[PDB]
């Protein structure tokens, strides 16, 4: 088969500058004809992929004057000038020249804001949830960048560990921010053995790690 | 105006066979191939194979070919492609798409689990000059879930979060909503929870407390 290497798997960029990325073909993409049978693809978050370059270096309909293809046959460079906070989302190319079609793991391209704090946020278990006898202690980290946060929990002042769980969001694509979410998950029974619950956050955006809780009962 | 509309999530069990459909709509069917492209959860894209749909040939992509089979039925502008043996590594996103590269089908979820479904409890997140305040969906089988704010009519900071599998072997998520603090005493908030699996709906309302 022609091996599509792409490789770096992230690029950052600043909105307004503009951002270059590579992928490399096994096998020369020229065919006798002339043309050269690459495509680039756009995936944004949730949705199905759409084509932004054909042939290396045609840009396809509806597709903005900021985004071209050029390459060599076997390397080839998705440019893209002005970069908007809209652009994340990962791209990948893919060979057409021969069967099987193949495919580049893909680039995502991430918008390098201004470094911002979260906003944190605690939520107690529902009483409604501590009838069915379990107790899931949330915090919230809000609109942050960069992506990397750490969530470390407390309860009656006690390191926790092994009783956590974190979901991050995708870059919000038009602040360019991230939120994540941890959930405490204990039973109802071990839930009311204690009194203080919280979570301490470590960010970039922080000169020291933030504190959020609340005490059982309030 | 030009559509592929894929069937909808598939939850099966292993060892079985599954096929999907991709209907065409807005142009002439048999004039164009049909592509099939497979993504696992959080990974690339992987080509299976295409189909001809004006003569019935096919190519594969040999990792497919002794778990794949495209067809086409030129009566109802439908293209088909059933997977056989099923096990977890056929989880995934699989598109059909038109050839050219333009023109994408929506997508079809297929999970191959012999887990039972299981309809989700929905819990508030209750708020304490920004207030946040959300909705924690725990505990269902398969994925997706959906939620929406106020019957779509809130979507300005909203987060819903990726689900997460849980050591049970279940899903949960949260979705949560950034608000005006002046607005918890005027203002309704109610996160519409959608489990189409087992057919759950709520549609819970979110006080302060
Ligand atoms: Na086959």
């Known amino acids: 088969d022609i091996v599509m290497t792409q490789a770096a798997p992230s690029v950052p960029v600043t909105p307004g500058e503009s951002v270059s990325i590579s992928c490399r073909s096994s096998?020369?993409?020229?065919?006798?004809?002339?043309?050269?049978?690459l495509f680039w693809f756009l995936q944004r978050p949730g949705q199905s992929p759409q084509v932004l370059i054909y042939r290396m270096s045609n840009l396809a309909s509806g597709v903005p004057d900021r985004f071209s293809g050029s390459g060599s046959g076997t390397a080839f460079t998705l440019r893209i000038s002005r970069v908007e906070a809209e652009d994340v989302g990962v791209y990948y190319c893919?060979?057409?020249?021969?069967?099987?079609?193949?495919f580049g793991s893909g680039t995502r391209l991430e918008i390098k804001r201004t470094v911002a704090a979260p906003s944190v946020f605690i939520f107690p278990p529902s009483d409604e949830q501590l009838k069915s006898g379990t107790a899931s202690v949330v915090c919230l980290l809000n609109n942050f960048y960069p992506r990397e946060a750490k969530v470390q929990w407390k309860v009656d002042n006690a390191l926790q560990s092994g009783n956590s769980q974190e979901s991050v969001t995708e870059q919000d694509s038009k602040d360019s921010t991230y939120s994540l979410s941890s959930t405490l998950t204990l039973s109802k029974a071990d839930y009311e053995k204690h009194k203080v619950y919280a979570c301490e956050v470590t960010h970039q955006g922080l000169s020291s790690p933030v504190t959020k809780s609340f005490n059982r009962g309030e | 105006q030009v559509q592929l509309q894929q069937s909808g999530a598939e939850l099966v069990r292993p060892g079985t066979s599954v096929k999907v459909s991709c209907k065409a709509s807005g142009y002439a069917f048999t004039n164009y191939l049909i592509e099939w492209i497979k993504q696992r959860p959080g990974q690339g894209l992987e080509w299976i194979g295409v189909?001809?749909?004006?003569?019935?040939?096919?190519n594969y992509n040999e990792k497919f070919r002794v778990k794949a089979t495209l067809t086409a039925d030129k009566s109802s502008s439908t293209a088909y492609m059933q997977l056989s043996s099923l096990t977890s590594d056929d989880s995934a996103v699989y598109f059909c798409a038109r050839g050219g590269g333009y023109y994408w089908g929506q997508g079809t979820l297929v999970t191959v689990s012999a887990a039972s479904t299981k309809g989700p409890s929905v819990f508030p997140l209750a708020p304490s000059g920004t207030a946040a305040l959300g909705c924690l969906v725990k505990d269902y089988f398969p994925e997706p879930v959906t939620v929406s704010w106020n019957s779509g009519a809130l979507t300005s900071g909203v987060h819903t979060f990726p689900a997460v599998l849980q050591s049970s072997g279940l899903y949960s998520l949260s979705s949560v909503v950034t608000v005006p603090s002046s607005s918890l005493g005027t203002q309704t908030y109610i996160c519409n929870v959608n489990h189409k699996p087992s057919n759950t709906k709520v549609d819970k309302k979110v006080e302060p407390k």
């Open positions: 189909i001809n749909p004006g003569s019935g040939g096919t």
């Open positions: 096998k020369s993409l020229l065919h006798s004809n002339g043309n050269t049978y």
């Open positions: 893919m060979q057409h020249l021969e069967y099987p079609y193949t």
